[PDB]
Amino acid sequence: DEFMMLLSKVEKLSEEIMEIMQNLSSIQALEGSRELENLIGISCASHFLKREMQKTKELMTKVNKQKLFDSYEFLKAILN
Amino acid sequence: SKDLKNQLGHLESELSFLSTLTGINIRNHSKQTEDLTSIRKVLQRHRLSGNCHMVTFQLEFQILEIQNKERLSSAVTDLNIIMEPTECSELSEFVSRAEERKDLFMFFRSLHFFVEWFEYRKRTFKHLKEKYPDAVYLSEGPSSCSMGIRSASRPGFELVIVWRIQIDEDGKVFPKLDLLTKVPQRALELDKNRAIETAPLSFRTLVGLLGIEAALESLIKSLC
Amino acid sequence: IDKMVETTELMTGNIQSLKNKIQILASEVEEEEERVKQMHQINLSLPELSQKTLKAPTLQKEILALIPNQNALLKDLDILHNSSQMKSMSTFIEEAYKKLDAS
Amino acid sequence: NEQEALEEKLENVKAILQAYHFTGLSGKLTSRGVCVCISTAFEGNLLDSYFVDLVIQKPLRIHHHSVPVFIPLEEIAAKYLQTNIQHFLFSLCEYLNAYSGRKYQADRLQSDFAALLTGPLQRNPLCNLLSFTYKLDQSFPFCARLLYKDLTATLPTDVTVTCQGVEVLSTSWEEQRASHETLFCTKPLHQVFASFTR
Amino acid sequence: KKRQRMIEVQDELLRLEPQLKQLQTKYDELKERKSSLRNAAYFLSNLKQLYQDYSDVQAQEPNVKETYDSSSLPALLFKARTLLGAESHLRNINHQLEKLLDQ
């Protein structure tokens, strides 16, 4: 079950990925301007990611426990 | 009791036909009536949930019917709709716009057009995903806006197609296509013809010349 | 009679001239419209897009003129693109997405 | 017994159809085909509704309708009847909604703000061309012409304003006419008139 | 007698006007069609040749430390979108997680 290993390694990776996330203020400086958030599609905001990762853990473990893994013809195909 | 069962079956068939023709499947509907008479004023609150084939919604509004001797004015005093929390920010922007404009029919029609364009985008991306699996790299998935083309010989050279769906202030829905190239400067120093800066405009002219999928497959073949 | 017969005769002369021009242009365009598809294939019913999308402003120039300090951000954008941590993160995300698409 | 449950199902499905009645477009099954009811509303104000009769037999034909004649329905029928009939219905909804909104704006202008208007404003049946002169209370005469080159939108495609009977003598007239032109081009008709009337 | 001449001359003038209009429209759409086709062909050929005559220099040096110009910043930024949206993407799949466990 390599899923445990990948979860552990991403959890250990999280600390330094947020460390390098906060390394530069230019990324934080461009935050809050919708002119780029609408262009990229959603937003530029990663501050509650700790809760996201600590919440996905139980969800993924539960998933593992449960093991979840023309117009004529179109109109005539419905009336039948 | 066979006649009653026959009428129920006929009504169910008609309801299914209307739902699959219009494209809207509604959930349960609730109605409340309040009489505020001073010339008569009635406040009617309606609530209903539903879905369009891909997306669910839950709406609740109230209208004020003013019955007079010669006129019967109906105005949507308040409306409030809720979506599911998807990643489409423009969807929320349009929801806010419709909320502050207090209109209903344009919302339904725009939602229909939006899901229509979304389904064409998804079906087009997924077809090209399987047609040339050795030259396509769908990084985000068929339900996204990005498309990533890359050659397995060299991972350094790859580009992206951005397909966006936009809703104007009036309420219409229109798509847009563009490409972004992640090319190293080694190509710039190799070729002095300088045929990479004009890629966007030329590509948009190309897609307006012989179609969308034709231009995409031509690009795939040229990159092959 | 004089003015309006003059008008219609000038008009029909112009009509004949334009007909000859369009005929010669249509005969001339053939050679290049088969020459274009020599080394390329000639040509899923997707409706053709409107001209408004064709004449709409493109995204690359808007992005370039919208964000300042290109090099000041690139000096770390290249470094992070050369870093392997978010590359492994992206590979994990892609594996999860293809797992979902497999079902 | 089963009668109560059957009646409950009947009333529930009737309520569901009455709910579909409010989405703007409704349909009813008849012997010759389907009868479609189309509704128009502008800014939440419901207006008159129309109906169209269709035939299911191939090829699709039109039996009769009550749409006004000046609405160009023949061409759109010829070019979208046989394919994507729902798109045809949605385009017809666009046309009717725009036309009803334009008529409502014109009627509200005619009825409500009759004091500022001096003479009757020229109007065409399609309501895609307006031309009127107005005096607002000093005296600042203006004449405005609005042309609607599109039929699927309620906003003017081009608006022009001129000062008739008086020469431009101050920048106040220039700024007033520029503001009127911008308001006409962007905001609805009656909204701006109700705005600067106070 | 001349009244009939009036009427008939107006007749041919009127019935020839639309033909002139249609011919003008056909000509001035065909010209731009041909120009656009030629330009697209030129661009496609030039890009194909650039890729073909580059395809070997990358093979000469597989892992050269190659940086990117200001024109590649948008795409790289568009690559960073999910990088700043992955957590939000998780929410979506987290929602799908409930959609998966509604049983």
In this complex, do B87 and A38 lie within 8 Å of one another by their Cβ atoms?
no
List the one residue out of D150, D130, D128, D67 whose CA is nearest residue B172: D150
**The pair of three-digit structure tokens given for residue B188, joined into one six-digit string:** 């710039």
The size of the B-C interface in CB pairs under 8 A is: 58
Distance from CA of residue B163 to its chain's centroid? 12
CA E77 – CA B160 distance, rounded (Å): 11
Please state the φ and ψ torsions of residue B19, each to the nearest 5 degrees: -65, -45
How far is CA A54 from each of CA A11, A50, A59, C88, rounded to the nearest angstrom? 9, 6, 10, 19
* Beta carbons of B42 and B65 less than 8 angstroms apart: yes
Task: Report the residue of A18, A40, A64, A68 to disrupt the E interface, i.e. the one with the largest count of E CBs within 10 Å.
Answer: A40
Are E20 and C100 inside 8 Å of each other by CB?
Answer: no
Collect all residues with Cβ–Cβ distance below 8 Å to E48 and sequence separation of at least 6.
B222
- Residue B209's nearest CA partner among C53, E40, C37 is E40
Contacts of B74 in chain D (CB under 8 A): 44-46
Q: What is d(CA D64, CA D61) in angstroms, rounded to the nearest whole number? A: 10
Distance between CA atoms of residues B114 and B53, nearest Å = 12
DSSP string, E36-94: HHHHHHHHHHHHHHHHHHHTTHHHHSTT------GGGHHHHHHHHHHHHHHHHHHHHHH
The answer to whether the bond into D141 is cis (omega within 30° of 0) is: no
E87:A63 CB<8 A: no
DSSP state of D117: B
Q: What's the CA angle centered on B7, arms B3 and B8, to 5 degrees? A: 115
Q: How far is CA E84 from the centre of its chain?
A: 29
Residues 6+ apart with CB under 8 A from D16: B15, B26, B29
Mutate to test the interface with D, among A73, A74, A75, A76 (most CBs of D within 10 A): A75
Residues in chain A within 8 Å Cβ distance of B90: 38
- Residue that is written with structure tokens 């509200």 in the block: D108
Is C25's CB within 8 Å of E16's CB? no
Of the candidates E92, B83, C95, which has an alpha carbon nearest to the alpha carbon of residue A56? Answer: E92
Three-class secondary structure of residue D61 per DSSP: coil
Residue C89's nearest CA partner among D80, E15, E82 is E82
Residue E57 CB partners (closer than 8 Å, separation 6+): B186, B190
Q: Return the biggest CA–CA distance within chain B.
A: 85
**Rounded Cα distance, D161 and D131, in Å:** 10
CA dihedral E56, E62, E63, E69 (to 10 degrees): 20
Residue D49, burial from CB neighbour count under 10 angstroms (0-12, 13-18, 19+):
middle
Please tell me the distance from the alpha carbon of residue B140 to that of residue E88, in angstroms, as a whole number. Answer: 13
Cα(E35)–Cα(E24) distance, integer angstroms: 17
What residue type is C31 in one-letter code?
A: E
Q: What amino acid is encoded at A76 in this protein?
A: K
Cβ neighbors of A23 (< 8 A, separation 6 or more) are: C76
Residue where the block lists tokens 């012989």: B210
**Residue E74: closest CA among A57, D142, A39, D161:** A39
Q: Which of D4, D92, D103, D120 is nearest to D45 (CA)?
A: D103
Q: What is the DSSP letter of B141?
A: -
Cβ-contact B102, D43 below 8 angstroms = yes
Torsions phi, psi for B126 (to 5 deg): -70, -30
- D17: which chain B residues are within 8 Å (Cβ-Cβ)? 15, 18
Find chains touching chain C: ≥3 CB pairs under 8 Å: A, B, E
User: CA E51 to CA E47: how far, in whole Å?
Assistant: 6
DSSP secondary structure code for residue B53 in this structure: T
Cβ proximity of D184 and D161 under 8 Å: yes
Measured in degrees and rounded to the nearest 5, phi and psi for residue B174 equal -140, 145
Decide if B155 contacts E66 (C-beta within 8 A). Answer: no
Does residue E34 contact residue C29 with C-beta atoms inside 8 Å? yes
- The shortest CB-CB distance from D45 to any of B15, B75, B113 is to B75
How many helices (H) and strands (E) chain A has is answered by: 5, 0
Q: What is the residue type of C64?
A: L
Chain breaks in chain E (C to N over 2.5 A) after: none
The span from the CA of D5 to the CA of A18, in Å, is 60
Contact D196, D136 (CB under 8 A): yes
Going by C-alpha positions, the residue among B168, B74, B26 that lies closest to residue D39 is: B74
CB contact at 8 A, B24 and B108? yes
Q: D54 forms bridges with which residues in the sheet?
A: D62
Vertex A40: Cα angle to B139 and B99 (nearest 5): 120
* Closest CA relative to residue D46, chosen from B44, B41, B104: B104
Cβ contact B54:B119 at 8 Å: yes
Question: Cα D59 to chain center, whole Å?
Answer: 31
- Give the integer Cα–Cα distance in Å for D128 and D47: 19
* Cβ D159 vs Cβ D181: under 8 Å: yes
Cα-flanking dihedrals φ and ψ of residue D51, to 5°? -140, 155
Strand (E) positions, chain D? 25-29, 34-42, 45-54, 62-65, 122-123, 129-136, 140-147, 158-162
Pairing relation of β-strands B154-167 and B173-182?
A: antiparallel
CB contact under 8 A, B175 and C40: no
Return d(Cα B99, Cα D148) in angstroms, integer.
27
Closest CA to C103 of D54, E99, E43, B107: E99
C-alpha to C-alpha distance for D8 and D1, rounded to whole angstroms: 12
* Minimal-distance CA residue of chain B relative to E68: B184
**E75 touching chain A per CB within 8 A:** no
Which of D144, D123, D126 is CA-nearest to residue D135?
D144
- Across the strands, what pairs with B61? B46, B79
Contacts of residue E101, defined as CB under 8 A and 6 or more positions apart, other chains included, come to A62, A63, A66, A68
CB-CB under 8 Å, E79 with C29: no
Instruction: Report CB contact under 8 Å: B201, C52.
Output: no
Find, among A79, B164, B12, E83, the residue nearest to D12 by Cα.
B12
Cis preceding-peptide flag for D72 (omega within 30 of 0): no
> Looking at this protein, which amino acid is placed at residue A7?
L
- Of D88, D108, D89, nearest to D154 (Cα)? D108
A74: closest CA of chain B, how far (Å)? 10
Choose among E87, E97, E101: nearest Cβ to A49.
E87
Q: Pull the structure tokens for residue E96.
A: 């799908």
> What Å resolution does this PDB entry report?
3.2
Breaks after residues in chain B, judged by C–N over 2.5 Å = 38
Q: How many helices (H) and strands (E) in chain D?
A: 5, 8
Assigned token pair, B57: 């919604």
| Contact status, residue B136 vs residue B80, Cβ threshold 8 Å | no
Which residues of B sit within 8 Å Cβ distance of C? 120, 124, 127, 139-142, 162, 174-178, 180, 200-201, 204-205, 207-208, 210-214, 217-218, 221
Chain centroid to CA D57: 32
Chain length of chain E: 103
Tell me how far apart the alpha carbons of residues B201 and D167 are, in angstroms, rounded to a whole number: 48
B21 contacts A79 by C-beta, under 8 angstroms? no
CB-based contact C74:E73 (threshold 8 Å): yes
CA distance linking residue B210 with residue C42, whole number of Å: 10
Residues of A in contact with C66 (CB under 8 A): 35-36, 39
The Cα E34–Cα E37 span in angstroms is 5
The strand pair at B154-167 and B40-52 is best described as unpaired
**Beta strands D25-29 and D34-42: pairing type?**
antiparallel
* Cα B84 versus chain centre, distance: 14
All residues of chain E having their beta carbon less than 8 Å from the beta carbon of residue B206 are: 40, 43-44
Residue pair B50/B42 in contact (Cβ under 8 Å)? The answer is no
Q: Tell me the C-alpha distance between E66 and E69, whole Å.
A: 10
Contacts across the A-B interface (CB distance below 8 Å) = 14
Whether A70 and D83 lie within 8 Å, measured CB to CB: yes
Tell me the technique behind this structure: cryo-EM
The residue among D79, D30, D75 whose CA lies nearest residue D52 is D30
